[PDB]
Design a protein around this motif. Structure first.
Motif, PDB file in Angstrom:
ATOM      1  N   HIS A  56       0.714  -1.238  -0.087  1.00 27.74           N
ATOM      2  CA  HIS A  56       0.010  -0.064  -0.071  1.00 27.74           C
ATOM      3  C   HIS A  56       0.944   1.216  -0.038  1.00 27.74           C
ATOM      4  CE1 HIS A  56      -2.625   2.924   2.579  1.00 27.74           C
ATOM      5  NE2 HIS A  56      -3.104   3.007   1.095  1.00 27.74           N
ATOM      6  N   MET A  57       1.574   1.526   1.078  1.00 33.26           N
ATOM      7  CA  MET A  57       2.295   2.939   1.286  1.00 33.26           C
ATOM      8  C   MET A  57       3.707   2.634   2.147  1.00 33.26           C
ATOM      9  SD  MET A  57       0.891   5.313  -0.717  1.00 33.26           S
ATOM     10  CE  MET A  57       1.245   6.965  -0.125  1.00 33.26           C
ATOM     11  N   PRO A  74       0.876  -1.991  10.712  1.00 29.93           N
ATOM     12  CA  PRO A  74       0.832  -0.895  11.607  1.00 29.93           C
ATOM     13  C   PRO A  74       0.059   0.607  11.068  1.00 29.93           C
ATOM     14  CG  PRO A  74       2.971  -1.253  11.255  1.00 29.93           C
ATOM     15  CD  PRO A  74       2.480  -2.171  10.068  1.00 29.93           C
ATOM     16  N   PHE A  75       0.391   0.728   9.999  1.00 36.54           N
ATOM     17  CA  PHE A  75      -0.097   1.965   9.304  1.00 36.54           C
ATOM     18  C   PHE A  75      -1.466   2.067   9.126  1.00 36.54           C
ATOM     19  CE2 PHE A  75       1.989   5.129   6.193  1.00 36.54           C
ATOM     20  CZ  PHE A  75       1.452   6.447   6.825  1.00 36.54           C
ATOM     21  N   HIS A  76      -2.174   1.489   8.175  1.00 34.74           N
ATOM     22  CA  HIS A  76      -3.752   1.296   7.891  1.00 34.74           C
ATOM     23  C   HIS A  76      -4.256   0.372   7.993  1.00 34.74           C
ATOM     24  CE1 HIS A  76      -1.253   4.442   5.457  1.00 34.74           C
ATOM     25  NE2 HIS A  76      -2.091   5.269   5.914  1.00 34.74           N
ATOM     26  N   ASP A  77      -3.761  -0.843   8.904  1.00 36.17           N
ATOM     27  CA  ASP A  77      -4.225  -2.236   9.289  1.00 36.17           C
ATOM     28  C   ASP A  77      -4.683  -2.966   8.159  1.00 36.17           C
ATOM     29  OD1 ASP A  77      -4.977  -3.293  11.842  1.00 36.17           O
ATOM     30  OD2 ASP A  77      -6.969  -3.235  11.138  1.00 36.17           O
ATOM     31  N   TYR A  91     -11.353  -0.688   6.601  1.00 37.35           N
ATOM     32  CA  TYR A  91     -12.297   0.782   6.471  1.00 37.35           C
ATOM     33  C   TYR A  91     -12.801   1.003   5.150  1.00 37.35           C
ATOM     34  CZ  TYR A  91      -7.740   2.173   5.083  1.00 37.35           C
ATOM     35  OH  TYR A  91      -6.414   2.383   4.167  1.00 37.35           O
ATOM     36  N   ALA A  92     -12.531  -0.034   4.138  1.00 36.30           N
ATOM     37  CA  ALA A  92     -13.001   0.440   3.023  1.00 36.30           C
ATOM     38  C   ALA A  92     -14.199  -0.072   2.297  1.00 36.30           C
ATOM     39  CB  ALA A  92     -11.948   0.190   2.005  1.00 36.30           C
TER      40      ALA A  92
ATOM     41  N   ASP B 161       3.252  12.465   1.465  1.00 35.82           N
ATOM     42  CA  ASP B 161       2.192  11.454   1.310  1.00 35.82           C
ATOM     43  C   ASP B 161       1.108  11.724   2.426  1.00 35.82           C
ATOM     44  OD1 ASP B 161       2.766  10.694  -1.413  1.00 35.82           O
ATOM     45  OD2 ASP B 161       4.189   9.136  -0.748  1.00 35.82           O
ATOM     46  N   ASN B 162       1.752  12.044   3.602  1.00 41.71           N
ATOM     47  CA  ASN B 162       0.863  12.208   4.615  1.00 41.71           C
ATOM     48  C   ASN B 162      -0.620  13.357   4.387  1.00 41.71           C
ATOM     49  OD1 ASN B 162       1.697  11.469   7.953  1.00 41.71           O
ATOM     50  ND2 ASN B 162       2.713  10.688   5.961  1.00 41.71           N
ATOM     51  N   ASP B 165      -3.610  11.422   3.445  1.00 37.81           N
ATOM     52  CA  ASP B 165      -3.750  10.171   4.055  1.00 37.81           C
ATOM     53  C   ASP B 165      -5.053  10.298   5.003  1.00 37.81           C
ATOM     54  OD1 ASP B 165      -3.753   8.008   5.745  1.00 37.81           O
ATOM     55  OD2 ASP B 165      -1.662   7.525   5.358  1.00 37.81           O
ATOM     56  N   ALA B 167      -7.122   7.896   6.280  1.00 39.23           N
ATOM     57  CA  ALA B 167      -7.372   6.708   7.392  1.00 39.23           C
ATOM     58  C   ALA B 167      -6.301   6.306   8.458  1.00 39.23           C
ATOM     59  CB  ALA B 167      -7.478   5.260   6.524  1.00 39.23           C
ATOM     60  N   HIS B 168      -5.020   7.053   8.242  1.00 40.44           N
ATOM     61  CA  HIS B 168      -3.991   6.810   9.338  1.00 40.44           C
ATOM     62  C   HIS B 168      -4.385   7.658  10.739  1.00 40.44           C
ATOM     63  CE1 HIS B 168      -2.431  11.023   8.883  1.00 40.44           C
ATOM     64  NE2 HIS B 168      -1.480  10.503   9.577  1.00 40.44           N
ATOM     65  N   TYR B 171      -5.502   5.127  13.086  1.00 36.55           N
ATOM     66  CA  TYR B 171      -4.698   3.865  13.368  1.00 36.55           C
ATOM     67  C   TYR B 171      -3.547   4.560  14.142  1.00 36.55           C
ATOM     68  CZ  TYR B 171      -7.673   0.983  10.656  1.00 36.55           C
ATOM     69  OH  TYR B 171      -8.837   0.555  10.385  1.00 36.55           O
ATOM     70  N   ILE B 172      -3.016   5.543  13.543  1.00 33.99           N
ATOM     71  CA  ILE B 172      -1.844   6.359  14.095  1.00 33.99           C
ATOM     72  C   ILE B 172      -2.117   7.352  15.333  1.00 33.99           C
ATOM     73  CG2 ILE B 172       0.447   7.765  13.569  1.00 33.99           C
ATOM     74  CD1 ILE B 172       0.251   4.997  12.652  1.00 33.99           C
ATOM     75  N   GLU B 302     -10.720   5.039  -1.087  1.00 33.33           N
ATOM     76  CA  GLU B 302     -10.598   6.019   0.287  1.00 33.33           C
ATOM     77  C   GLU B 302      -9.122   6.623   0.363  1.00 33.33           C
ATOM     78  OE1 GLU B 302     -12.115   3.112   0.097  1.00 33.33           O
ATOM     79  OE2 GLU B 302     -14.030   3.041   1.180  1.00 33.33           O
ATOM     80  N   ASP B 303      -8.406   6.262  -0.537  1.00 29.20           N
ATOM     81  CA  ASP B 303      -6.882   6.816  -0.416  1.00 29.20           C
ATOM     82  C   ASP B 303      -6.990   8.169  -1.164  1.00 29.20           C
ATOM     83  OD1 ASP B 303      -4.678   5.150   0.399  1.00 29.20           O
ATOM     84  OD2 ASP B 303      -5.296   3.761  -1.229  1.00 29.20           O
ATOM     85  N   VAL B 306      -3.527  10.674  -3.974  1.00 26.05           N
ATOM     86  CA  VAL B 306      -2.476  10.137  -3.805  1.00 26.05           C
ATOM     87  C   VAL B 306      -1.692  10.672  -5.065  1.00 26.05           C
ATOM     88  CG1 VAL B 306      -0.482   8.296  -3.767  1.00 26.05           C
ATOM     89  CG2 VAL B 306      -2.650   8.664  -2.154  1.00 26.05           C
TER      90      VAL B 306
END
Ligand SMILES: C[C@]12CCC(=O)C=C1CC[C@@H]1[C@@H]2CC[C@]2(C)C(=O)CC[C@@H]12
Ligand SMILES: C[C@]12CCC(=O)C=C1CC[C@@H]1[C@@H]2CC[C@]2(C)C(=O)CC[C@@H]12
Ligand SMILES: C[C@]12CCC(=O)C=C1CC[C@@H]1[C@@H]2CC[C@]2(C)C(=O)CC[C@@H]12
Ligand code: FES
Ligand code: FES
Ligand code: FES
Ligand SMILES: [Fe+3]
Ligand SMILES: [Fe+3]
Ligand SMILES: [Fe+3]
Lengths: 355, 355, 355
Positions: A56-57, A74-77, A91-92, B161-162, B165, B167-168, B171-172, B302-303, B306
Motif C-alpha cells: 500500500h504505502m 501498523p499503518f492502515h491495518d 475501513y474500505a 504523502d501524509n 492520508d 485513514a491513518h 490507527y496512528i 478511500e486513499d 495520492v
C-alpha cells in the motif's frame, strides 16, 4: 581480487532458526536476500513469510500485529495472508480484487523454520526437502541450543570451502584426521571424517558425517568416544544471506542425554557436551571472521576437491534448465592423510618432549 | 524498488530553524542540499548563507569568526560577504578582483530562518514567499518550542504523502476523521480535517488546516475543543534535505496562552498543550522512521488523491519553464469518511464492551 | 568538486613507523595502499612486508606466527618468505614449485621502517633512498616520540599544499614569517622559513628547513632560539594511504638533550621541548581534519608556488617514462613577506593596546 560477487542469491531452503522463536503471537522482522521479510504464524500456528514492506504505502508489516490468519500492517491495518493475498482493507468499501504481495514458501522440520528462495520464482523441488532429524523431538536428546552471528564484509560462499579442507583439522581443531572423504551428488555435498585428539593439547576419537542439503543447511552427526564412553551429538551449520556481502551464520547443538543419573546432573553434563561442540564450531568462526576468499587458489594434492565442490555449489546459482551434469553427477574422493599424520605426529612428539 | 531517487533538490524556501539560534556572534555549520553551508549574521543582525568551504584552499568557514559584515575563514582569515563576494585578503597587496563564492538567498519570517534553493540558480519568485505567522510575535502566544531529528535511509519526499492520508488518523493518531478534504493549487497543497478523539483510548474535537507553502514547509493551524474549553495551536512541519537519502525533519509548536491565571500556572499549562501537539507529531515520526516509499502504490478509493499530490510535488523538481498545468491547476477532493466511521465506531464499541 | 581522486597510489618510500614496534617476534597487520599487508621480522631481525592474505585460501598472515625466516599462515601453516616465496607446505608431499605472493621492498633508516610502493611494480631507484638521520642513533638526542592518526574523508595529497603556505604561519602557528622560500627539484620539495613568535600570544626565533623526500616523507629540522638559549629539534611529517579517501598521518619528534644537568631534569625538559613541537604539528592536523581540497583554487601573489608544487607532486602518479621535465627541474621562489608583516604587526599591536 578475489572473485566477482554473485548476482543472485542461491536457490534453496534456508533456515531462519528455531520455529518456536517465531511464534509468541506477534510478527517478526528478518533482513534476508537483499530485502526485509516478515515472519508470522496464523491462528493454526502454521508459519508464514512475506515481503516485509506493505504494498500500500510501505509500512513495516514486521511491526504490525497478527489478526486471525493475517498480518495487519501498523499503518492502515490492511490484512495480508500467508499466501500474500490482500484479504481485507478494514475501513474500505472494497478490498482490492486479487491484490498480492510476494509470499515465500515455508517448511518446519525438526523444530526449525525454513524458507524457500529461488531467483526464478519456482516452488521447491520436493526432492530437496530438508530431512527430519528425529533426535530433535526425542526426549532422550536435548532441545536445540541455538546461536547466530552477523558476519559482515563476506559472502556466504566463503564458508562452503571447509567441506573439502582436511588439513585445517590439525591447526584449527587440534586433532589428527586419519580418514577423510568427500562425496558430492545432486543437491548434497558431504564430508566423512575420522579424527583423533592431539596428545599435545590435553584422547578423543571422533567419527563425523557432515552434509549440506542444498546450498545453506548442513547437518553434522558427531559420534565421539573418549576411551569407552561414547557420546552422540548433532550440530547444525547453516546460514542465510542478508546482502551479497553479509550473512547470518547460525549453529545449533543437540546431544544424546547420558542415561541415567540425577535430572540435575544429566543437565550439568549435557551443558558441557553442548558447550564443547559449540567451541569446536567457534574455532571455524574465528577463521571465517578473519579471512578472504581466494577465487584462483594455489592448491596442493592434499587440498582434495576444492574445484569440484565449488562446481557443485554453482548449481544453485544457475537456472535449473542450465544445471550442468558435472555439477550434480556423483563425485567422490578420499584424501590420503598418512604422510600428513607422520609429519604431524612428529610435530606433536617434538612438543611433548619440549616439556 | 521503489522509486528512482531524484537527481536535484527541490526548488523552494527551506527552513533551517529558529533565527536567534543562528546568531550569538559566531558562524554556524549546516549540512544541506548535498553540501555544507555556513550561516552567519552581519553587524546589523541580518542572516546570511554561503557555501561552507573556502574558495581559497578549502577551509571551513563555519568554524571561522564573524568580523564586521563578513565571515573570516579560520585558515588564512579571508573575508567573505553575505552576497558571496571576497571583500578582503587581510595580508595581501591585492584582494582578488570580483571573486565570489556561492551565496544563498535568505529570509526571516516569524522568527524562523529560511534559505532559497534552486537547481536552476534563479532567485525566489516573490509569489511563493513564506507567510508571516503573527502569533509568533504576539505575547498572547508562547515562543517556538523547536525540535529536529536526522532521518537516514529515506528521501524527504517520503513524508509528503501524509497530506492525502485520511485513514491513518484512526490507527496512528487515535481519532475519527469525520471530515477530510485536500486542495492543491500553485505552490500550495493543503489538508482540511475535522477529527474526534476515540472513546476507547481515553472527548476532543479538532479542526485542522495544514498547508505546505512550497515543497518543504507546512504550517498547521490546530483549533481543538475539549467540551467547552477551546485551545489554539500552531504547528510547523518542515524539513530540509541533507543528501538524496537523508534529511532533517523539524517541528515547532506555539499555543495561545490561557488567559488568565498565575504566570507560573499559565506556563505549566502551555507546556502541557505544547508537549501534547509534539506527541501528535511524534506519532507520524515513528511511522516515517520505519517505512519505505512505494512508487507504484496499491490504492483504494478511500486513499483520495495520492497521485495528484505527488504530481503537484513534481513541480519543484522540474525547470520552471517545464512546469505542466496539471501540477499547478486547482485540484480538490473530499474523501467520504462515513462508511469508514461506521466501521471504526464498531471497532471502538467492540473494544469498550470488551472491558 | 573539488578534484577527481587519483587512480593509483604514489610511487615512493612510505614510512610505516618505528621499526622496533614491528618486532616482538610476531607479525603485524597494516591496512595500506587499498589492501592489507603483513609486516614481520625474520630470524636475523630484518623486516619484511608481503600482501597480508594467504594465496592458498585467504588466511590472514598478519595473525599467524613467525617460524624461522618465514611467516606461517594461521589457517594451514604454510610458510612464506620475505621475498614472497612459498618456502614450505609442512604437511604436504610437495610444496608448490616457484609459488610466490607479492613482496614489498623494505628499508630501515634512522630506526624507522619504510616500504616501497610502485604501481608499475619496479624496484626503488637508489637515488630516492630516504636519508639517514644520525641524530636518531646519537645519545645526545632523545629517541623517537611517535604518533599516528587515521584521517577519513580525505586523500593524502590534501596535506602537501602546506609546503607552499606562508600566511598560515600567522593564523595557525601564531608566528610571523619574515623569510619564506620554496625549492622543488627532482624528488625533493622543500620549505625554508624564518619565524618569529607573536608578542600578542605570550619571544621565540625559529629557523626551519623542511623537505619531502619523495611523495610521503618529510624531515623538518627545527633550530629555535628563545633569547640566548638555542634548542634543536627534528620533526618527521609523514603519511601513508589506506584508501584513496583515508590515510594514516604520523609524526615523530626528537630533540637535542640539554647538556647537562640531572638525568631526571634533562628528561623533564626534553619532554617539554617534544610536547611543544607536537602541539605545533597538531595545529596543522586540526585544519587538515576540518577542510576540503580545492582543485581550482582562487590565488593571490602571496600564495607563492601552489601550482608548481602540485606539478612536482604529480611526478609520483605518472609512469617514470612519462615524467615531464617541468615536474622535476629546479624551481625556486621566495615569497615577499614584508607587507604582510607590516599588516600583521599592526594587528598584533592593536591587540596588545586593546589590553
Ligand atoms: C560443522 C563443521 C564445520 C563446517 C563444515 O564445512 C564441516 C563441518 C563438519 C566437521 C565439524 C565442523 C565444525 C567443527 C567440528 C565440530 C569440530 O570441531 C570437529 C568436527 C567439526
Ligand atoms: C502536521 C501533520 C503531519 C504531516 C501532514 O502531512 C499533515 C499534518 C496535519 C495534521 C497533523 C499532523 C501532525 C500530527 C497531528 C497534530 C495530530 O496528531 C492531529 C492532527 C495532525
Ligand atoms: C612540518 C610542518 C608541517 C607540514 C609542512 O608542510 C611543513 C612543515 C614545516 C614547518 C613546521 C610544520 C609543522 C608545525 C611547525 C613545527 C610549527 O609549528 C612551526 C614550524 C612548523
Ligand atoms: S502501509 Fe500497509 S496498510 Fe497502508
Ligand atoms: S582557506 Fe579560506 S582563507 Fe585560505
Ligand atoms: S590459507 Fe594460508 S595456509 Fe591455507
Ligand atoms: Fe571446520
Ligand atoms: Fe499525520
Ligand atoms: Fe604548517
Amino acid at each position: 581480487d578475489a572473485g566477482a560477487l554473485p548476482t543472485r542469491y542461491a536457490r534453496g531452503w534456508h533456515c531462519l532458526g528455531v520455529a518456536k522463536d517465531y511464534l509468541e503471537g506477534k510478527p517478526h522482522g528478518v533482513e534476508a536476500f537483499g530485502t526485509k521479510l516478515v515472519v508470522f504464524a496464523d491462528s493454526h500456528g502454521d508459519l508464514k513469510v512475506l515481503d516485509g514492506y506493505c504494498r500500500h504505502m510501505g509500512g513495516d508489516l514486521s511491526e504490525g500485529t497478527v489478526k486471525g490468519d493475517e498480518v495487519a500492517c501498523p499503518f492502515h491495518d490492511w490484512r495480508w495472508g500467508g499466501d500474500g493475498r490482500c484479504k481485507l482493507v478494514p475501513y474500505a468499501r472494497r478490498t482490492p480484487r486479487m491484490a498480492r504481495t510476494r509470499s515465500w514458501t515455508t517448511d518446519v522440520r525438526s523444530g526449525l523454520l525454513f524458507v524457500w528462495h529461488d531467483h526464478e520464482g519456482n516452488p521447491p523441488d520436493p526432492a530437496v526437502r530438508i530431512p527430519e532429524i528425529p533426535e530433535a523431538a526425542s526426549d532422550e536428546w536435548t532441545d536445540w541450543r541455538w546461536n547466530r552471528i552477523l558476519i559482515e564484509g563476506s559472502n556466504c560462499r566463503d564458508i562452503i570451502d571447509n567441506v573439502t579442507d582436511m588439513a585445517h583439522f590439525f591447526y584449527i581443531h587440534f586433532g589428527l584426521p586419519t580418514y577423510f572423504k568427500n562425496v558430492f551428488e545432486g543437491h548434497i555435498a558431504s564430508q566423512y571424517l575420522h579424527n583423533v585428539g592431539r596428545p599435545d593439547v590435553d584422547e578423543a576419537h571422533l567419527d563425523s558425517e557432515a552434509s549440506y542439503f542444498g546450498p545453506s543447511f548442513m547437518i553434522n552427526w558427531l559420534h565421539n568416544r573418549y576411551g569407552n564412553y561414547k557420546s552422540e551429538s548433532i550440530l547444525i551449520n547453516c546460514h542465510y544471506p542478508v546482502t551479497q556481502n553479509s550473512f547470518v551464520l547460525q549453529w545449533g547443538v543437540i546431544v544424546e542425554k547420558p542415561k541415567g543419573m540425577s535430572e540435575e546432573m544429566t543437565d550439568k553434563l549435557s551443558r558441557v557436551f553442548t558447550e564443547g561442540v559449540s567451541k569446536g564450531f567457534l574455532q571455524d568462526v574465528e577463521i571465517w571472521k578473519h579471512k578472504t576468499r581466494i577465487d584462483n587458489p594455489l592448491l596442493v594434492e592434499e587440498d582434495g576437491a576444492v574445484y569440484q565442490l565449488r562446481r557443485w555449489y554453482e548449481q544453485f546459482y544457475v537456472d535449473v534448465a542450465d544445471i550442468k551434469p558435472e555439477m550434480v553427477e556423483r563425485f567422490e574422493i578420499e584424501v590420503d592423510t598418512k604422510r600428513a599424520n607422520e609429519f604431524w605426529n612428529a610435530e606433536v612428539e617434538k612438543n611433548l618432549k619440549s616439556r
